Design a protein around this ligand. Structure first.
Ligand SMILES: CC(C)CCC[C@@H](C)[C@H]1CC[C@H]2[C@@H]3CC=C4C[C@@H](OC(=O)CCC(=O)O)CC[C@]4(C)[C@H]3CC[C@]12C
Ligand SMILES: CC(C)CCC[C@@H](C)[C@H]1CC[C@H]2[C@@H]3CC=C4C[C@@H](OC(=O)CCC(=O)O)CC[C@]4(C)[C@H]3CC[C@]12C
Ligand SMILES: CC(C)CCC[C@@H](C)[C@H]1CC[C@H]2[C@@H]3CC=C4C[C@@H](OC(=O)CCC(=O)O)CC[C@]4(C)[C@H]3CC[C@]12C
Ligand SMILES: CC(C)CCC[C@@H](C)[C@H]1CC[C@H]2[C@@H]3CC=C4C[C@@H](OC(=O)CCC(=O)O)CC[C@]4(C)[C@H]3CC[C@]12C
Ligand SMILES: CCCCCCCCCCCCCCCC
Ligand SMILES: CCCCCCCCCCCCCC
Length: 597
């Protein structure tokens, strides 16, 4: 027993190895009745219904299953810089959302999907090409929240892993088929309130009230004893990946430092992934066509500032508390998204597990309902109406919309079962998003903004970038290691190479083939899809001016100013923790109380 506070674990190769905290009945109830319960609740909310609400709406559509599970994964590694580099992809989102919402009103105000603009601007061959890159994004993104949720449910309640994978989408389908087609303005408020209450409780548990970890001076003392050079991590005391001894790639092998190379590489990958999530996902566009930016453009900045605090504070609390407690978490287990449940069980046994399950399944249901209504609209407006029957009455569009939801929900369950059998995990899929669909980001931006891009260059760049990125991503893994499998492929180097190659070459071919043969476009035909510009011109100016300042302040200046601190001292870590606590508390207070006022 090297440590006095972790004697009960002595050596253990894993945290979850039997004797589940809860029983299978709770797991089945959670994975079955959540959709019906909130459907009834939303029906009651609608019945009673008949810059603060907009912020609550923005926050509710940006919290996914990765915001909870993945942000603590890169905190168990790399120490202090992981949560920061994960949360830094928030100021870009508000700028992109504002620009997209402003520019859709002034060039295509009567559209439903992004692929309806591709057919209008360019021809038909490019419509099919980008219709495949849009469905792949939905397939990849939906498969990410079906792996983490199933893993967490199986870890906590002991329910069969292959039964949860198929039964999780059915609850979301039931929720979406009933009220939930954006429902009303109150469901977002309820979701945000629950999420922020859970966040506040978890943050305040580990730094103020817990008996095991009740001070920022205990976490500091325990984090610097794990990376001691006198520590032995041989076979009887530690296993291969188990967070023992100095951290490789960190200055002096410390968890308390901003000088981490792995964290910086992860942030570089995360930027490309966030770029790929905004332009290629049809749910973002669906949310951007229903916005009123000429009068309510100021809520997006508040929404982004409030959303910044969730992946930062939660990962700082639940991620650094697992290292300080000396839990036998393995690398494969931490990859799957099982870091927060372990800390919740260790610190708040049998009561924090239910709270974390509720917080996770709120996001799972909210995000899966949006993914289901990004493909039913795609199918019903870009395939059925355009090619199979181009003369359709309303009663015949509502049947197709309802059938597409069932079809996608039933297909994704089988896909999730297959992926769980094959051993794929969240975190491997999170990093690989930009390699696959990163080549169609710049063509779509050119379609929305640039007036010289043409059809042929778009197809050429989109098709070439994916192939080149995949080739580079596989060849780097083959060259730098001895094999091509799920272990060597999911590393920072190959993933960074694939991401950069995929994103960069798709915007260079399109920008070269268009400067030779420009297609001067006035967006006349996109405005005919089946004052006022002064306000839209003053909203865009405000968004551009006030969105860049915070992006520069957060993504650039703040990490630069923290490098001279080298290894954090007791007094700088106090400030670092107090910043997170204050940010989380103030954001929760603003988003819970102000909309009432
Ligand atoms: C704005 C954010 C999201 C990205 C900014 C990009 C660059 C400013 C970063 C990203 C990756 C960083 C690199 C990651 C790893 C290293 C290795 C590092 O080498 C060492 O000192 C380790 C070698 C040893 O000591 O044995 C030198 C800095 C460098 C090149 C870093 C320099 C700064 C880089 C290029
Ligand atoms: C084994 C891992 C954990 C560490 C060692 C891997 C990396 C340090 C190396 C391996 C291959 C390298 C990459 C090989 C090729 C490229 C493509 C290149 O991308 C371009 O800009 C392409 C040109 C363009 O199209 O504009 C940029 C450098 C990069 C990412 C290299 C960056 C450094 C990488 C990722
Ligand atoms: C645009 C140009 C003109 C200025 C850019 C400003 C910063 C990006 C530079 C200026 C001074 C740099 C610092 C100069 C010295 C160091 C000490 C250095 O510490 C060590 O690794 C040495 C300690 C040791 O190894 O014993 C860490 C980087 C840091 C903070 C540098 C980080 C980057 C800084 C802040
Ligand atoms: C002996 C030498 C070769 C190495 C050791 C000296 C530096 C590493 C230290 C010593 C004093 C430090 C300075 C003490 C006070 C300031 C003022 C401070 O300036 C402000 O921004 C003031 C606030 C404002 O007016 O906006 C910025 C940090 C700085 C330059 C510090 C930067 C780091 C310095 C130069
Ligand atoms: C002593 C063992 C090796 C230590 C290597 C530390 C390298 C840290 C470099 C990463 C710093 C990136 C800062 C980026 C800020 C924008
Ligand atoms: C062994 C010590 C290595 C220290 C390397 C520090 C590198 C810092 C780079 C900062 C780049 C900032 C770009 C804006």
């Amino acid at each position: 027993p090297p440590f006095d506070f972790s004697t009960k674990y002595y050596r253990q190769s894993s945290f979850f190895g039997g004797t589940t905290v809860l029983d299978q009945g709770v797991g089945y109830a959670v994975i079955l009745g959540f959709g019906a319960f909130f459907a009834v609740f939303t029906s009651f909310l609608v019945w009673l219904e008949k810059t603060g609400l907009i912020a609550s709406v923005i926050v509710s559509q940006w919290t996914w299953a990765a915001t909870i599970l993945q942000s603590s994964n890169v905190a168990w590694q790399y120490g202090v810089s992981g949560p920061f580099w994960y949360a830094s992809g928030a100021t870009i989102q508000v700028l992109l959302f504002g620009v997209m919402a402003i520019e859709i009103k002034r060039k295509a105000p009567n559209a439903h999907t992004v692929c309806e603009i591709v057919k209008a601007r360019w021809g038909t061959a490019t419509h099919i090409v980008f219709l495949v890159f849009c469905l792949a994004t939905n397939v990849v993104v939906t498969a990410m929240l079906l792996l983490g949720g199933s893993a967490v449910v199986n870890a906590l309640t002991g329910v069969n892993l292959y039964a949860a994978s198929f039964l999780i989408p059915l609850g979301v389908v039931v929720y979406t088929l009933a009220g939930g087609l954006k429902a009303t303005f109150l469901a977002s408020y309820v979701h945000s309130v629950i999420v922020h209450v859970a966040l506040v409780v978890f943050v305040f548990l580990v730094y103020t009230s817990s008996k095991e970890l009740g001070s920022p001076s205990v976490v500091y003392d325990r984090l610097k004893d794990m990376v001691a050079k006198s520590r032995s991590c041989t076979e009887p005391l530690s296993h291969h990946g188990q967070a023992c001894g100095p951290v490789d790639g960190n200055f002096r092998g410390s968890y308390l430092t901003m000088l981490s190379s792995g964290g910086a590489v992860f942030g570089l990958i995360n930027i490309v992934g966030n770029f790929g999530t905004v332009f290629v996902d049809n749910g973002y566009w669906v949310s951007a066509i229903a916005a009123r930016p000429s009068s309510t453009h100021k809520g997006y900045l508040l929404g982004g500032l409030v959303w910044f605090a969730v992946p930062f504070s939660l990962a700082t609390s639940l991620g650094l508390g697992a290292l300080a407690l000396d839990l036998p978490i393995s690398k494969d287990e931490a990859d799957r998204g099982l870091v927060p449940p372990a800390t919740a069980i260790a610190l708040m046994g049998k009561s924090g597990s239910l709270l974390l399950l509720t917080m996770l399944f709120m996001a799972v249901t909210s995000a899966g309902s949006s993914e289901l209504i990004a493909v039913s609209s795609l199918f019903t407006y870009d395939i059925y109406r355009t090619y199979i029957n181009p003369r359709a009455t309303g009663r015949q569009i509502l049947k197709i919309s309802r059938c597409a939801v069932l079809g996608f929900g039933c297909f994704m369950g089988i896909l999730a079962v297959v992926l769980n059998k094959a051993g794929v995990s969240l975190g491997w899929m999170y990093l690989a998003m930009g390699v696959l669909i990163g080549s169609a980001v710049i063509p779509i931006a050119f379609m929305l903004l640039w007036s010289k891009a043409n059809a042929f260059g778009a197809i050429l760049g989109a098709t070439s970038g994916c192939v080149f990125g995949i080739i580079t991503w596989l060849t780097t893994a083959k060259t730098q290691y001895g094999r091509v499998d799920l272990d060597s492929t999911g590393k920072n180097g190959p993933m960074l190479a694939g991401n950069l190659v995929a994103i960069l070459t798709g915007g260079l071919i399109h920008a070269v083939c268009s400067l030779v043969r420009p297609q001067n476009y006035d967006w006349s035909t996109t405005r005919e899809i089946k004052l006022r510009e002064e306000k839209l011109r003053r909203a865009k100016a405000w968004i551009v001016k006030w969105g860049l300042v915070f992006t520069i302040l957060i993504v650039v200046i703040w990490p630069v100013l923290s490098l001279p601190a080298r290894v954090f001292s007791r007094g700088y870590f106090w400030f670092w923790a107090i910043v997170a606590i204050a940010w989380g508390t103030i954001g929760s207070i603003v988003i819970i109380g102000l909309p009432l006022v």
